[PDB]
Amino acid sequence: KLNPALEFRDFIQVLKDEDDLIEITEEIDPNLEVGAIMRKAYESHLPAPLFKNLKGASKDLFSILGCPAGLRSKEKGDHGRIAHHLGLDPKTTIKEIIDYLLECKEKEPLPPITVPVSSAPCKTHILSEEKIHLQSLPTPYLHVSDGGKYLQTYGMWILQTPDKKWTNWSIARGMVVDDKHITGLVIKPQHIRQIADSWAAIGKANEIPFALCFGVPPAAILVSSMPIPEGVSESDYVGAILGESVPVVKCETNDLMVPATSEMVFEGTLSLTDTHLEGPFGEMHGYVFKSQGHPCPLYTVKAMSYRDNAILPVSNPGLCTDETHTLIGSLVATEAKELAIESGLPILDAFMPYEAQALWLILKVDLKGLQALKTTPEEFCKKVGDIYFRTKVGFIVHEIILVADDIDIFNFKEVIWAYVTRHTPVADQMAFDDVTSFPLAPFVSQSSRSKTMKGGKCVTNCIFRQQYERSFDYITCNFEKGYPKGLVDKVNENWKRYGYK
Amino acid sequence: KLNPALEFRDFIQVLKDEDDLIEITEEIDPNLEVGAIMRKAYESHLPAPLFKNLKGASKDLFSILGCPAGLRSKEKGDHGRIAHHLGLDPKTTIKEIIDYLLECKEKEPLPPITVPVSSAPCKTHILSEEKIHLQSLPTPYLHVSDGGKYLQTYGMWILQTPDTNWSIARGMVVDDKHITGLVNEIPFALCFGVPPAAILVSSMESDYVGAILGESVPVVKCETNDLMVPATSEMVFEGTLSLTDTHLEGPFGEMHGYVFKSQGHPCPLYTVKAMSYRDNAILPVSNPGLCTDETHTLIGSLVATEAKELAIESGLPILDAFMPYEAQALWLILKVDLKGLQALKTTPEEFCKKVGDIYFRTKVGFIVHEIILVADDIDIFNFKEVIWAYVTRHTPVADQMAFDDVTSFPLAPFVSQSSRSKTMKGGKCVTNCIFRQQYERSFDYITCNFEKGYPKGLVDKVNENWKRYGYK
Ligand SMILES: C=Cc1ccc(O)cc1
Numbered sequence: 013k014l015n016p017a018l019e020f021r022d023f024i025q026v027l028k029d030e031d032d033l034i035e036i037t038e039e040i041d042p043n044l045e046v047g048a049i050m051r052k053a054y055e056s057h058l059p060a061p062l063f064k065n066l067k068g069a070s071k072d073l074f075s076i077l078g079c080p081a082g083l084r085s086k087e088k089g090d091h092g093r094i095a096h097h098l099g100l101d102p103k104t105t106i107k108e109i110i111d112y113l114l115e116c117k118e119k120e121p122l123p124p125i126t127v128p129v130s131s132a133p134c135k136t137h138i139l140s141e142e143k144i145h146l147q148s149l150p151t152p153y154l155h156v157s158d159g160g161k162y163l164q165t166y167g168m169w170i171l172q173t174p175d176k177k178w179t180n181w182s183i184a185r186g187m188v189v190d191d192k193h194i195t196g197l198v199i200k201p202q203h204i205r206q207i208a209d210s211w212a213a214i215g216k217a218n219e220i221p222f223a224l225c226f227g228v229p230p231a232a233i234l235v236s237s238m239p240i241p242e243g244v245s246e247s248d249y250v251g252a253i254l255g256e257s258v259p260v261v262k263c264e265t266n267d268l269m270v271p272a273t274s275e276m277v278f279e280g281t282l283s284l285t286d287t288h289l290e291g292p293f294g295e296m297h298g299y300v301f302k303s304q305g306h307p308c309p310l311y312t313v314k315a316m317s318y319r320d321n322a323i324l325p326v327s328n329p330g331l332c333t334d335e336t337h338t339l340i341g342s343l344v345a346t347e348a349k350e351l352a353i354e355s356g357l358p359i360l361d362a363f364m365p366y367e368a369q370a371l372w373l374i375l376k377v378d379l380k381g382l383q384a385l386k387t388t389p390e391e392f393c394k395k396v397g398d399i400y401f402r403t404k405v406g407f408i409v410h411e412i413i414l415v416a417d418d419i420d421i422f423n424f425k426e427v428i429w430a431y432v433t434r435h436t437p438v439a440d441q442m443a444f445d446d447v448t449s450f451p452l453a454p455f456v457s458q459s460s461r462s463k464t465m466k467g468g469k470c471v472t473n474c475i476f477r478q479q480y481e482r483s484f485d486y487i488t489c490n491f492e493k494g495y496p497k498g499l500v501d502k503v504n505e506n507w508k509r510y511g512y513k
Numbered sequence: 514k515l516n517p518a519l520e521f522r523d524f525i526q527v528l529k530d531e532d533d534l535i536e537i538t539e540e541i542d543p544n545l546e547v548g549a550i551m552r553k554a555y556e557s558h559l560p561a562p563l564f565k566n567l568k569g570a571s572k573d574l575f576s577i578l579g580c581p582a583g584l585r586s587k588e589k590g591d592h593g594r595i596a597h598h599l600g601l602d603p604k605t606t607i608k609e610i611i612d613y614l615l616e617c618k619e620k621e622p623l624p625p626i627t628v629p630v631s632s633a634p635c636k637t638h639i640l641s642e643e644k645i646h647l648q649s650l651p652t653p654y655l656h657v658s659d660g661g662k663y664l665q666t667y668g669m670w671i672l673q674t675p676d677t678n679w680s681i682a683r684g685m686v687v688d689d690k691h692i693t694g695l696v697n698e699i700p701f702a703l704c705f706g707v708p709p710a711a712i713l714v715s716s717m718e719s720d721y722v723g724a725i726l727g728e729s730v731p732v733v734k735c736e737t738n739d740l741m742v743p744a745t746s747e748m749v750f751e752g753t754l755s756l757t758d759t760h761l762e763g764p765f766g767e768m769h770g771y772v773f774k775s776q777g778h779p780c781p782l783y784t785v786k787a788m789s790y791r792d793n794a795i796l797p798v799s800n801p802g803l804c805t806d807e808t809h810t811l812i813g814s815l816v817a818t819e820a821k822e823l824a825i826e827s828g829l830p831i832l833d834a835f836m837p838y839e840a841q842a843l844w845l846i847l848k849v850d851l852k853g854l855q856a857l858k859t860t861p862e863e864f865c866k867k868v869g870d871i872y873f874r875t876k877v878g879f880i881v882h883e884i885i886l887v888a889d890d891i892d893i894f895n896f897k898e899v900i901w902a903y904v905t906r907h908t909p910v911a912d913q914m915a916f917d918d919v920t921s922f923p924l925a926p927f928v929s930q931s932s933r934s935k936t937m938k939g940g941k942c943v944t945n946c947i948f949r950q951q952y953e954r955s956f957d958y959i960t961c962n963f964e965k966g967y968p969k970g971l972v973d974k975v976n977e978n979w980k981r982y983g984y985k
């Protein structure tokens with residue numbers, strides 16, 4: 013009786029069951045080869061590679077599961093891998109997945125429960141410091157010109173305040189530096205709470221305890237992906253999704269609680285004063301730009317534990333579509349729809365098209381609601397921008413596009429049709445000059461805007477002005493929407509009879 | 514022997530040979546059913562429908578050939594129908610077709626040859642005024658809420674000064690004697706099923722069809738005036754154009770995908786006074802809407818040809834030009850040679866201003882509302898590369914230059930459904946999607962996909978062993 017949301021190995025099992033996993037049992041070099049295979053699989057929406065035979069791997073450390081949230085063919089449900097993180101029907105649509113994530117926000121939060129060490133797979137093998145040799149792991153080198161081997165693409169950082177009452181679960185790319193150290197680049201909006209500020213206040217910024225966990229319950233790795241509100245707990249929300257407390261055990265060398273069925277757990281200390289250059293990485297917009305960016309904190313690994321035949325899950329970002337579009341984009345879209353509901357905005361749905369590399373947020377507007385506001389394009393677009401761009405939700409978003417309710421925003425054919433035909437270029441875009449820029453956006457980081465880090469966002473109005481006032485009847489000139497139902501039905505019925513295959 | 518560029522019926526035959534044509538022999542209503550079947554075909558890049566059994570047809574008048582320049586599957590050559598208009602091999606890429614069209618500008622123009630009535634198939638049947646009843650023709654009603662049946666969507670208007678203009682422009686049947694066209698006794702000819710090279714040239718000239726074909730177009734005089742018409746037309750309507758007499762050309766589903774309703778404006782009335790046609794005549798029809806139909810494929814690629822010629826003549830460092838079908842022919846994408854750009858010693862602001870002025874103050878940039886500049890690592894004929902470049906390489910608004918003083922394309926929905934429709938000025942822009950460093954020097958980054966992100970060889974190694982790993 014499989015539970016993909018709770019057990020990473022059950023998640024692996026259902027994929028296999030659905031002919032959506034390929035067990036690659038021949039030697040594959042973690043240098044470039046793993047990433048290339050993953051990239052081919054991503055781009056044609058093919059089954060996920062499980063590399064059971066990596067060059068340089070010991071029996072236990074490790075295999076690699078690539079593309080844990082890529083797309084796959086429609087018949088199996090194209091967002092099936094995301095649905096299994098939440099334990100949903102695999103043919104659930106992304107629209108319904110997002111709605112379900114909002115529904116879970118109504119559920120009662122469910123704190124983690126501590127389980128016995130002898131039952132917890134992640135404690136099966138336990139290494140003291142002297143046995144920590146990060147450079148002997150078959151850590152993948154994912155893109156050409158990457159600054160180093162990235163071990164942490166799909167694990168969970170676990171950190172805590174000194175008084176142990178705020179625990180933070182999050183994902184942030186983590187590069188191996190040498191045999192004992194890792195450095196991770198965190199990119200976050202400003203004016204949100206930092207775990208480090210707690211330790212820097214009591215003067216221990218040099219020895220902040222951390223755990224890094226791989227192959228955790230898939231609901232957990234999904235929830236720690238993007239922008240959950242400041243009050244809500246991460247673990248308590250994963251519990252509501254699981255309908256059960258996340259099973260956790262304590263770390264060997266510190267007080268942190270890690271998920272019991274993790275594949276791998278690394279423990280140690282990070283230092284805010286001891287820094288290292290975190291050389292470049294192929295990112296969500298499709299580029300590896302040269303240049304190591306400003307020094308990141310150094311993480312010292314002092315202990316680790318893992319299960320038999322451990323599996324490292326990996327995300328290899330680039331061109332659509334991978335985890336950085338499908339998780340990151342849909343989590344933002346979820347928070348964006350939630351924010352809209354709380355503010356009274358007449359918003360039906362929200363999505364970040366994979367073709368726009370998670371730089372576009374499309375808001376599907378209810379026209380009857382829009383009309384009740386008795387507002388104008390100019391007023392509405394400013395109102396929408398302030399709400400989203402001057403908030404943590406619009407952080408990664410550089411363009412917000414508003415469309416009427418006749419547009420299926422989850423189908424990019426319709427989105428690109430509405431974008432292009434329904435807004436006057438420039439005159440129907442509203443610039444936001446003084447809001448916070450997303451540092452990763454290539455047009456930001458490859459311009460002088462990388463210094464100011466302000467502006468370069470816009471709200472684009474793709475709602476006809478008449479649609480702000482009254483019903484506006486036009487014909488959409490395609491086959492399924494241009495013609496009476498029935499004519500459509502008849503033509504479809506007779507299609508093979510006409511001569512078409 | 515087949516010459517599809519020269520002869521419409523050879524064109525139909527090469528489509529059959531290639532299984533790119535479906536002869537629909539059951540009864541089909543010209544009211545909506547023709548149009549919907551065409552839209553279904555266009556939208557899935559499927560074989561052209563030839564309706565041989567129209568409700569209301571006589572034996573000769575007429576069958577309908579739909580989708581004459583639609584797209585088809587890639588294995589047959591996705592742009593095959595366009596290549597057959599030019600007599601090219603059907604697996605010719607659209608880039609090569611655009612390059613061939615520029616090349617034709619070098620060739621000797623062959624004037625059309627007059628042939629005697631006896632050898633002109635369009636003269637087989639001749640109808641004098643009293644026998645003209647346009648409403649009896651099985652003219653298609655193509656979209657819901659069209660203002661009328663449109664007889665003219667893929668035919669050729671011919672007009673001549675009193676002592677020669679070949680144009681395509683939509684035409685709506687008004688009554689038994691009158692057609693009205695979108696824009697006292699001016700003679701005109703209206704020809705259907707002309708030589709395919711001719712209909713392509715008239716899309717955005719008679720002598721220039723000669724340069725495409727390599728031989729002269731056979732022509733013949735009208736019955737009631739001095740206009741020369743293609744000898745092998747399926748049908749020829751002859752008559753009188755008046756500008757004093759006007760009619761409301763009711764709305765029509767157009768190239769951007771909308772019928773905007775009850776929206777019309779007065780247009781000159783054409784009076785049909787004679788007709789001639791051949792045995793079993795065929796009416797070619799184009800049903801515009803969502804991508805991809807003729808208005809994106811023919812119009813777009815003719816604009817790209819001119820745009821590339823204009824670039825060369827101007828000294829702009831432009832490699833290729835294309836109007837992506839997904840953007841409904843509103844976007845012109847220009848592929849820039851970075852060495853060229855760098856040799857110019859220019860800036861985004863200067864270059865965009867110069868590119869815009871060249872294109873938007875000219876009839877070439879007429880239908881284009883946004884011009885997109887990209888470096889030469891972008892294959893602009895692949896829209897997956899274009900939308901990637903557009904989104905990630907320009908700053909919204911800030912990397913965009915508005916042109917407010919230039920002529921607007923009236924059909925653009927954001928124009929026509931706004932107050933800018935009473936002015937027809939402005940609403941255009943040039944969008945820089947070239948990184949600022951690329952204006953100055955070599956800028957080497959990694960494109961993070963499979964085919965470009967990895968050393969080929971590894972790409973070949975993975976492609977080999979793909980089946981052996983377990984993939985299908
Ligand atoms: C703040 C979100 C975020 C998403 C992706 C990434 O690589 C860094 C930050």
Ligand SMILES: C=Cc1ccc(O)cc1
Nearest residue numbers: 683767768808812880924
């Ligand atoms: C001049 C181009 C053009 C394209 C379509 C249409 O309906 C009118 C003009």
